[PDB]
Amino acid sequence: AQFTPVLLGITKASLNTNSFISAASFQETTRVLTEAAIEGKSDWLRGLK
DNA sequence: GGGCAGTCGCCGTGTACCTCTCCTAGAGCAGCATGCGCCC
């Protein structure tokens, strides 16, 4: 595959985490929960918060 | 066809604690206690 490096930002990088529980409790609860429900995500409870 | 550029709508905006008040809805329908008129 090909790729290109990117520079994200403090709030864009924190909304792309692997756990939907930690992202839902930060900002934009409804959009995050809707996307997680559509994708059928699961959370394995790693890290604080 | 291929757009640039412009516009519109949604998201976000530090932490703990103390005191005073007002409100849980509002209109229809029937029961009741009161005031006043009536017949003896």
Q: Give residues 1-49 of chain A lying near strand B (Cβ < 7 A).
A: 27-28, 30-31
Give the three-state DSSP class for A6: coil
How many residues in total does chain A contain? 49
Give percent helix, percent strand, percent coil of chain A, each to the nearest 5. Answer: 45, 0, 55
And the tokens for A11?
């709030």
d(CA A22, CA A47): 10
Are A37 and A10 in contact, with CB atoms under 8 Å apart? no
Distance B37 C1' – A43 CA (angstroms): 86
Nominal resolution (angstroms): 2.8
Query: Cβ contacts of residue A49 below 8 Å, gap of 6+?
Result: A22, A25
Distance B33 C1' – A41 CA (angstroms): 71
Give the three-state DSSP class for A47: coil
Nucleotides of B under 7 A from a protein CB: 11-12
Instruction: Annotate A10-31 with DSSP letters as a single string.
Output: HHHHHTS-S-HHHHHTTS-HHH
Experimental method used, please?
Answer: cryo-EM
